[PDB]
Amino acid sequence: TEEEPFATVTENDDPHILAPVFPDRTNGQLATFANISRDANLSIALTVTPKDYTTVTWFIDGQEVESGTDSDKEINRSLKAGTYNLKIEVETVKGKKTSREGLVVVNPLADDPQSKEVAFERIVSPGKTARLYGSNLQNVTAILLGGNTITDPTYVESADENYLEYTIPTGVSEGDYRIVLQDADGNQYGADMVKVTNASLVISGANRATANVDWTISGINLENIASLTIGGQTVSQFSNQSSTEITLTCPDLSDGSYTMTGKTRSGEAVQFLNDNITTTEQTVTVSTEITLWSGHHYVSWDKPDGDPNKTFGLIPMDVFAGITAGSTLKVVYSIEPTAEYHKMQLATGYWTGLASEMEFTENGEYTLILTQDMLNKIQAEAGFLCVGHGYYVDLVTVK
Ligand SMILES: OC[C@H]1O[C@@H](O[C@H]2[C@H](O)[C@@H](O)[C@H](O[C@H]3[C@H](O)[C@@H](O)[C@H](O[C@H]4[C@H](O)[C@@H](O)[C@H](O[C@H]5[C@H](O)[C@@H](O)[C@H](O)O[C@@H]5CO)O[C@@H]4CO)O[C@@H]3CO)O[C@@H]2CO)[C@H](O)[C@@H](O)[C@@H]1O
Numbered sequence: 250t251e252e253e254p255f256a257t258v259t260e261n262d263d264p265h266i267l268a269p270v271f272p273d274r275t276n277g278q279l280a281t282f283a284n285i286s287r288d289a290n291l292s293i294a295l296t297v298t299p300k301d302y303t304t305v306t307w308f309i310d311g312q313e314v315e316s317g318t319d320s321d322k323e324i325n326r327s328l329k330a331g332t333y334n335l336k337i338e339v340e341t342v343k344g345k346k347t348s349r350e351g352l353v354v355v356n357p358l359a360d361d362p363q364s365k366e367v368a369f370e371r372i373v374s375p376g377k378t379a380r381l382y383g384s385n386l387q388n389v390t391a392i393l394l395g396g397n398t399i400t401d402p403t404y405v406e407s408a409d410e411n412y413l414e415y416t417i418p419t420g421v422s423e424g425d426y427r428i429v430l431q432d433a434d435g436n437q438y439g440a441d442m443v444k445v446t447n448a449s450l451v452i453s454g455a456n457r458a459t460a461n462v463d464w465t466i467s468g469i470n471l472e473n474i475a476s477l478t479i480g481g482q483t484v485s486q487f488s489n490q491s492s493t494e495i496t497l498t499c500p501d502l503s504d505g506s507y508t509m510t511g512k513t514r515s516g517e518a519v520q521f522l523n524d525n526i527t528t529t530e531q532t533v534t535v536s537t538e539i540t541l542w543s544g545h546h547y548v549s550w551d552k553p554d555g556d557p558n559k560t561f562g563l564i565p566m567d568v569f570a571g572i573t574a575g576s577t578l579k580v581v582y583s584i585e586p587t588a589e590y591h592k593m594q595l596a597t598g599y600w601t602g603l604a605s606e607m608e609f610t611e612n613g614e615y616t617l618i619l620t621q622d623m624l625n626k627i628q629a630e631a632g633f634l635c636v637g638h639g640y641y642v643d644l645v646t647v648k
C-alpha cells in the first residue's frame with residue numbers, strides 16, 4: 250500500500266529469486282529455461298524474497314499470461330509445439346523489481362504434424378506461395394496465420410524433401426506470426442514462426458562474388474529490384490529475375506571488401522539479411538578466378554604406369570609454389586557415361602590425399618582450400634595429382 254504511514258523493513262527489501270537458479274545468456278543469445286513435450290505442461294515454481302510482499306507476472310512472447318495455479322509464483326501452462334520467449338517479472342509492493350528472460354522449447358510428438366525452418370522458407374510474401382518442411386504434413390487441411398484460415402494446403406511430392414505448399418493471403422500486413430497446423434478432425438499443432446515482408450530481401454549468396462562472371466543471389470521479393478550497386482558500380486541488367494532469385498554479372502573490381510546496396514522500382518532501398526540482422530548495406534568479398542588448366546583429360550588408375558590418362562598431372566609444381574595459403578582450388582570434372590563407376594581424389598605426386606576420396610554419379614565442381622601445410626606437402630611430394638576412375642578433368646582454377 251502507498252497510504253501506509255511507513256513501510257516495514259521487509260517491504261522495502263530488494264526482490265531476489267532464490268530458486269530455481271536460471272542459466273545465464275549463451276553469448277547474447279538467450280538460454281533455455283524449459284525443454285518439454287507438447288503433451289506435458291510448462292512447470293516452473295519460484296521461491297522469492299520478500300515472502301509476502303512480491304507479485305510475479307509471466308509473459309509468453311511478450312504477451313502477459315495467467316499462471317495456471319492458485320499461487321501467482323508457480324506457472325502451469327499447456328503450450329503447442331514451438332520455441333517461446335518467457336519473461337519472469339517480479340515486483341515488490343514498493344515497486345523494486347528483478348527479471349529473468351529465457352527460451353521455452355516445446356517438442357512435438359512423433360506422429361504430430363510438425364514443421365521447423367530448414368533454410369529460409371519461413372520468410373514469406375503476401376499473395377505468393379510458401380513452403381513448410383517437416384513431418385506428417387499430409388494430415389494438414391488448414392494453416393492458421395494471424396487470424397486468417399488458409400484452407401488450400403497442397404502436399405507436394407519431390408525428388409528432394411516433400412513440403413506443404415500454401416498461399417499467403419494478400420490482406421496480411423508485415424510482421425512475424427506464430428502459425429498453427431489444423432487436422433480434418435479439428436486438432437491443432439504448433440509450427441513456430443513465419444515472417445511476412447513486402448521488402449525485396451536478399452537472404453543468401455551475397456557474401457562472396459567472383460569479378461566479371463555470373464553471380465546468383467537468393468531472396469523473397471527480388472523481381473521488384475531495379476538495380477544493385479557494388480563498389481561504386483551500378484548494375485541494372487540481369488540474366489534471371491524472379492521472386493526468389495536474381496543473377497547478374499559481378500562488375501570488374503579488384504580483390505577486397507565492398508559495400509553493396511540496391512533500389513526497388515518504387516525507389517525504396519533493397520534489404521539484406523545476414524545473421525537475422527536486416528541492413529540496407531551488404532559486405533561483399535570479391536576475388537578473381539585464375540585458370541590454371543583447361544581441356545578434357547580422362548583419369549583411370551586401371552591404365553598402366555606411364556599412361557598419360559592414369560592420373561591428371563599437367564599443372565607443374567612451380568605453379569603451386571606461387572599459390573598463397575588460404576586460396577581456393579576448384580576442379581571442374583565430368584563423368585564418362587560408359588564407365589562402371591566414378592571416384593576422384595585430389596592428392597600429391599606421392600598419392601597422399603589432400604582430402605577424401607569422393608564417389609559421384611553426375612558432373613560437378615570440387616573446391617578445396619589449400620592450407621600452407623597442403624602447399625608445403627605438394628612441393629615435398631612431387632606436385633599435384635587428380636586421381637581416380639571414370640571421369641574427366643575439364644578445368645582447374647584458383648582464387
Ligand atoms: O589398379 C586399380 C586400383 O588402383 C588403386 O590405386 C593405386 C594405384 O593403382 C597405384 O598406381 C598407386 O601407386 C602409387 C603409390 O600409391 C604412391 O605411393 C607412389 O608414389 C611414389 C612415387 O612414385 C615416387 O616417385 C616417390 O619417390 C620419391 C622418394 O620417396 C623420395 O625418397 C625421393 O627423395 O624422391 C622420390 C621422388 O622421385 O615415392 C612415392 C611413394 O613414397 O606412386 C605410385 C604410382 O607410381 O597406388 C594407388 C593406391 O594408393 C586404387 O586404390 C584401387 O581402388 C584400384 O582398384
Ligand code: NA
Pocket residue numbers: 383384410411
Ligand atoms: Na520429412
